């Protein structure tokens, strides 16, 4: 079980890095969407 | 094991918040894609 | 443990639905990116 | 428990493939965003 737990902790860290990378992309997308809306209005 | 279970419950909540954030982004993307298609047709 | 396992199976299904939703978005994004490249070339 | 562990290992592989697919999309998005910024400046 304690091998499994160490393996789970690594997995959890990987998934939390994934969550963070998605959060970064979501912010980059929001900035793009604002730039698009500015371009399209003009 | 019950330390692990508490840790898992927290992880599950984090992942379900991630799923929700992605769902929000998917909706924002759909709206953008519609606006793009409107702009490009015109 | 078997409560945990049932809980894990539900989580796994939720995560696999999330994976599928992302795959759908990735396809929608690819189609958008092609339409953009067509618009921008013209 | 060892049925569960085998099931977890499969899940972990699925999630790590998901992470990789997202990383690929993030790169594709970055390239698109650069192309957009080039188009919009001109």
Swiss-Prot record, chains A, B, C, D:
GO MF terms on file? identical protein binding; lipid binding; peptidoglycan binding
Q: What is the effect of changing residue 42 to S/T?
A: Does not affect the formation of murein-bound lipoprotein
What else the UniProt entry mentions is: About one-third of Lpp is covalently bound to peptidoglycan.
If researchers knock out this gene, what phenotype do they report?
A: Double lpp-ompA mutants are spherical and only grow in the presence of electrolytes such as 30 mM Mg(2+), and are sensitive to hydrophobic antibiotics and detergents. The peptidoglycan layer is no longer attached to the cell outer membrane which undergoes abundant blebbing.
Q: Which domain of life is it from?
A: Bacteria
In its keyword annotation, does this UniProt entry include Signal? yes
User: Has keyword Transcription regulation?
Assistant: no
The record's comment on protein family reads: Belongs to the Lpp family.
Organism, as annotated: Escherichia coli (strain K12)
The way it spans or sits in the membrane comes to:
Lipid-anchor; Peptidoglycan-anchor
Instruction: Tell me the protein's name.
Output: Major outer membrane lipoprotein Lpp
Cellular localisation:
Cell outer membrane; Secreted, Cell wall
**What keywords sit in the KW lines?**
Cell outer membrane, Cell wall, Coiled coil, Formylation, Lipoprotein, Membrane, Palmitate, Peptidoglycan-anchor, Repeat, Secreted, Signal
Query: Main role?
Result: An outer membrane lipoprotein that controls the distance between the inner and outer membranes; adding residues to Lpp increases the width of the periplasm. The only protein known to be covalently linked to the peptidoglycan network (PGN). Also non-covalently binds the PGN. The link between the cell outer membrane and PGN contributes to the maintenance of the structural and functional integrity of the cell envelope, and maintains the correct distance between the PGN and the outer membrane.
Q: Where are the sequence repeats?
A: 5-15
Q: Which residues form a coiled coil?
A: 1-42
Assembly notes: Homotrimer. Interacts with OmpA. Has been isolated from outer membrane preparations as an approximately 87 kDa complex, suggesting it also forms larger complexes. Seems to interact with TolB, Pal and TonB. In pull-down experiments interacts with CedA.
User: What range of the parent protein does this fragment cover?
Assistant: 34 to 75 of 78
GO annotation, cellular component aspect: cell outer membrane; extracellular region; membrane; outer membrane-bounded periplasmic space
A Gene Ontology biological process noted in the UniProt record is: periplasmic space organization
């Amino acid at each position: 079980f304690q091998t499994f737990n160490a393996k789970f902790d690594q997995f959890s860290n990987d998934m939390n890095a994934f969550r963070s990378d998605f959060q970064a992309f979501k912010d980059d997308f929001a900035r793009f969407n604002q730039r698009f809306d500015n371009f399209a209005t003009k």
